[PDB]
Every structure is written in structure tokens, then in C-alpha cells.
Amino acid sequence: ATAVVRCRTRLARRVVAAVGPDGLLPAPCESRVLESALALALLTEERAEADATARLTAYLRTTLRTAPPDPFQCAVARAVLGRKRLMFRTVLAALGATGFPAVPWEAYDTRPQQSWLHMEMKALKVLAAHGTGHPDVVRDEDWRALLPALEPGPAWECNNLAQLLALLALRHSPRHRPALGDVLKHVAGRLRPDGGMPFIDGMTVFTTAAAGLALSLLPAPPACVTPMADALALRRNPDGGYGFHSGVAQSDVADTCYVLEFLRRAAPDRHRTAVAEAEGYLLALRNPDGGFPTFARGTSSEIAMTAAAASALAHDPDRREEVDEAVRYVVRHQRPDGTFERSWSRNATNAVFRAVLALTGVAAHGEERRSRARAAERALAHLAATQNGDGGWGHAEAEPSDPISTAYAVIALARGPRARPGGPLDRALAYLVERQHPDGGYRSRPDQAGPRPLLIDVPALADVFVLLALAHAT
Known part of the structure; x- marks a missing residue:
């Protein structure tokens, strides 16, 4: 025919x-720079999983050189190596790349029905409170939203970005640190053959x-x-x-x-x-x-x-x-x-x-x-x-x-x-x-x-x- x-x-x-x-x-899903950079930041801050951190570092350098993603992810990678606007700005600020948004704390409060974005914005609120030197601002209902990130196995809702941001926030809390060690092992075990972290499974x-x-x-x-x-x-x-x-x-x-x-x-x-x-x-x-x-x-x-x-x-x-x-x-x-x-x-x-x-x-x-x-x-x-x-x-x-x-x-x-x-x-x-x-x-x-x-x-x-x-x- x-x-x-x-x-x-x-x-x-x-x-x-x-x-x-x-x-x-x-x-x-393929490795992505954003999540690979967040995983590197997390494991490095916790001085954990040396083998995984070196693979992540090599993945990011290769990818920046050969197939660089959009400018926001590029800026995120460079930060770690050396509403949507509010989210992305606070990610860069948590990594030291820009100032934290000077917004009322309520700017980070979203409807819980949007389950993934809700966890991400709660994690980013905690990062901003700690990053600006106001940890007392964080309420117990903010921490509570992050608890699924401490469960073993694959990320909650198959979402590696949400779990990584939540863990970057939770490592500031002495009450949650007993659970961190075991989940870092699971996170490190997710690296793909190219050394990177995907957004989702x-x-x-x-x-x-x-x-x-x-x-x-x-x-x-x-x-x-x-x-x-x-x-x-x-x-x-x-x-x-x-x-x-x-x-x-x-x-x-x-x-x-x-x-x-x-x-x-x-x-x-x-x-x-x-x-x-x-x-x-x-x-x-x-x-x-x-x-x-x-x-x-x-x-x-x-x-x-x-x-x-x-x-x-x-x-x-x-x-x-x-x-x-x-x-x-x-x-x-x-x-x-x-x-x-x-x-x-x-x-x-x-x-x-x-x-x-x-x-x-x-x-x-x-x-x-x-x-x-x-x-x-x-x-x-x-x-x-x-x-x-x-x-x-x-x-x-x-x-x-x-x-x-x-x-x-x-x-x-x-x-x-x-x-x-x-x-x-x-x-x-x-x-x-x-x-x-x-x-x-x-x-x-x-x-x-x-x-x-x-x-x-x-x-x-x-x-x-x-x-x-x-x-x-x-």
C-alpha cells in the first residue's frame, strides 16, 4: 500500500x-537538571552518599556543556555547582542564587486540593522562613504537610521534585531529622544510568x-x-x-x-x-x-x-x-x-x-x-x-x-x-x-x-x- x-x-x-x-x-522519565541539582544540594548538605553526589555532579556538568536546559534550570545548576514566579524565585533563593521574595508569608499558602503544589509551596515557605532568619514563623501545620517526604520507598505521588524540596526543608527541623537518614538512601538509589534524577518515576x-x-x-x-x-x-x-x-x-x-x-x-x-x-x-x-x-x-x-x-x-x-x-x-x-x-x-x-x-x-x-x-x-x-x-x-x-x-x-x-x-x-x-x-x-x-x-x-x-x-x- x-x-x-x-x-x-x-x-x-x-x-x-x-x-x-x-x-x-x-x-x-529522563533525568532533569532541576531535580538533579536539588538532589546534589540535599546530599551534599547532609554529607551523605558520596558516590551518588559525584555522579550527580558529573551529570550536571556534562548536561550544561552538551544539552543545556532552559535558563531557570541552568541558573539552578550553576547555583549548586558553585505564584509560579514566587515558587521559582524561592527555589533559586534557597540555593543562594537570589534574594528571598519580600512577600507576606501567606503568599505561600495554596489550596490543599492541589496536592503536589501544596507540598512544594509549604516546603518553599519553610526554606524562606529559615533562609531569611525567621525560623519561628514556621507553624506546626507547615511541617505536617511535609511528612509524606519521610516515608521510605518511591516518592509520594511519584514526584521527586516535591520530595526533594520537602527534605531540604525538613533537614532544618530537629524533630524530623531521625527519619532523614533512611530516606536519603532511597533518594540516592533513584539515580539513572546517566547519573541524574528524573522529575517523576x-x-x-x-x-x-x-x-x-x-x-x-x-x-x-x-x-x-x-x-x-x-x-x-x-x-x-x-x-x-x-x-x-x-x-x-x-x-x-x-x-x-x-x-x-x-x-x-x-x-x-x-x-x-x-x-x-x-x-x-x-x-x-x-x-x-x-x-x-x-x-x-x-x-x-x-x-x-x-x-x-x-x-x-x-x-x-x-x-x-x-x-x-x-x-x-x-x-x-x-x-x-x-x-x-x-x-x-x-x-x-x-x-x-x-x-x-x-x-x-x-x-x-x-x-x-x-x-x-x-x-x-x-x-x-x-x-x-x-x-x-x-x-x-x-x-x-x-x-x-x-x-x-x-x-x-x-x-x-x-x-x-x-x-x-x-x-x-x-x-x-x-x-x-x-x-x-x-x-x-x-x-x-x-x-x-x-x-x-x-x-x-x-x-x-x-x-x-x-x-x-x-x-x-x-
Whole structure:
């Protein structure tokens, strides 16, 4: 058949082969400068784990020299070697790189429902109180929020950044120091082969769900979709949603929508109860304006999450009203140039693809059909207007192409007119065909972020999102 189908086939064989007998597609996260620097600071201050500290030091020097990250992480590494604004500023101040923000202490107090950020901001509050010479300020409720960092094993919620900041704070407390020695051993044991510390253990639930969805959209889905569906469903949280990796108790809308989209196609009867519980999870999060947040009702609706939930819920015709109110929300928030707004993915094409799928997957007629079609047309026009000469898209309009940003654009354009020779979708597919490696895979600059906007590199996601685009486009 076509070069595109042959590319899709080779990629699908590779993705299937990567799924293990437990039904999971492993998705480890690469070492990151920020966490590697914090781990170095912590172990050095505690005069612990000499072998690990030297490996961390070598990792940071190599990475600064060969693949330097964004300027904030660079400044963090240089500090140790020799609200978001408040967080990042206080991190640099704790490492001696700048002054502590002259803010009321309440500036560090956040809603506990945002469990990871809450721990990070409490740890940073303690670091600022001690760093400015006001340790008496710290309240017992501040320390109490940090207690999960003293538990042995992997980090609480698989989050190495939160545990490291918490431990940097806790080492100032005589009452908590008996527990420090054993956790430092666990922290030191996490170093990757390159000597670095990753942000998180991985994103295997997110990645397995997106891969299952891609495989479920092929003409003949492989048999492995069933154990993949099984492996996801048995990991559901009590609220019916899904976190991004095994052992993540905080559910989120992005992960839950990929699981729900996959289960609806590959196991709607076998996992009927998990499907219903995921729909229930989403509906319980829905905001009065018709949008959906990432984690917690009462926080701002987000365009990409609202579009993802619209498409995920659209399968049930009984949810038509909530789905229409979500699509109406997407239309209302489209920007004057046809785009939407970034969040968990750092490229512009991510929210475009989610919006276009919501705008075209829910069947509409009459005035609302025209309104949705016009919005989808402007978004696809934005893609055509910003397409690079090589057929791909980058993270932003002037950036060089990358496969993941291009994959998102392809998913959207597959909802436009039929591909034609030399047209935008045709050229994008040709770009993806050309970027396929001998081993059948893709290598891409990463697009996930956390804490936004700092990039997270989960290399398993490149193959998975390219396969999802090729499954949509063929």
C-alpha cells in the first residue's frame, strides 16, 4: 500500500512489542537538571552518599556543556555547582542564587486540593522562613504537610521534585531529622544510568492509555489491547479517575480522558463499570461555566481539558447536554488568530487538536453546526498558516519541526477536507514518514511540562503520539 500505511505498520509493530506482559507500556522519565541539582544540594548538605553526589555532579556538568536546559534550570545548576514566579524565585533563593521574595508569608499558602503544589509551596515557605532568619514563623501545620517526604520507598505521588524540596526543608527541623537518614538512601538509589534524577518515576498510565487508544483506532487492533485495558482499569483511583503513573492517587482529567477513550473502544463491556466510574469522575469535576479543570472543581476551567472531556463523554448520548456546554465553552475561548492556549503540552498544536476533535466529533446541525465548523476551520487554518517548509510544525510558529508537535497537527487536519497531493495534511504525513528511524521509532523533543512550563522528557510518548496521528489519518 502507501508509504504512510507501511510507516504506520512498522510503528504499530514497535509499539505492540513495547507493551509488556503486565499490559503496560513502560514510560520512564529522563533525568532533569532541576531535580538533579536539588538532589546534589540535599546530599551534599547532609554529607551523605558520596558516590551518588559525584555522579550527580558529573551529570550536571556534562548536561550544561552538551544539552543545556532552559535558563531557570541552568541558573539552578550553576547555583549548586558553585505564584509560579514566587515558587521559582524561592527555589533559586534557597540555593543562594537570589534574594528571598519580600512577600507576606501567606503568599505561600495554596489550596490543599492541589496536592503536589501544596507540598512544594509549604516546603518553599519553610526554606524562606529559615533562609531569611525567621525560623519561628514556621507553624506546626507547615511541617505536617511535609511528612509524606519521610516515608521510605518511591516518592509520594511519584514526584521527586516535591520530595526533594520537602527534605531540604525538613533537614532544618530537629524533630524530623531521625527519619532523614533512611530516606536519603532511597533518594540516592533513584539515580539513572546517566547519573541524574528524573522529575517523576514515569508516565506509564498516560502513555499506556494513549497507546491503547492509538492501537484501538487501527483497522485490526492487536490482541494486546485487552491486557492494556485490564492493566489500566485495575489502577483506577477510588474517585473513578486515573493518575499519570502507577501509585499516583491524584486523578486528573487528561489521564482519565485517554483511559476512557481507550476503554470505550477496546473494552466497553468488559470494563463497563470502570467506564461509568470515569464518566462519573469527569462529571463531578465539571465547572458551572461548562468547562473542566485539570484536577479539582472550583479551579479554573482549561480549554484543552474541556475539549478532551467533551470528546470522552460524547460517546454516551445521555451526556449530550454536558458535552454541548463543553463544546460551546471551547468556541467561546478561541483566540482571534484561531488558536487556543497551552497548558500541559508546550506546543500550540496540542490544544488545537483537542479542540478540533471536540468541534467535529460531537454531531451538530443547524446554527450550532455552522458555529462549530467555522471554529474548526479557523483552527485548521492556523495550522496551515504556520506549517514549516519541511511539512512539520514546532512548539511555536518559528520553531523547527518536531514529530510530536506535527502528530498533534495531523490528528486535527485529519478532521478537515480530504488530503490532496501537496496539501497540508499530505505534506505533514510525508514529514512523519521521513522522520521514522530504522528501528521503526521516533525521537522527538518532548512536549510535556511539569511544573509548567518546565519540560519533562518521556521518550516513549514520541512513538505513541505519532501512531495516534497515523491511525487517525489513515
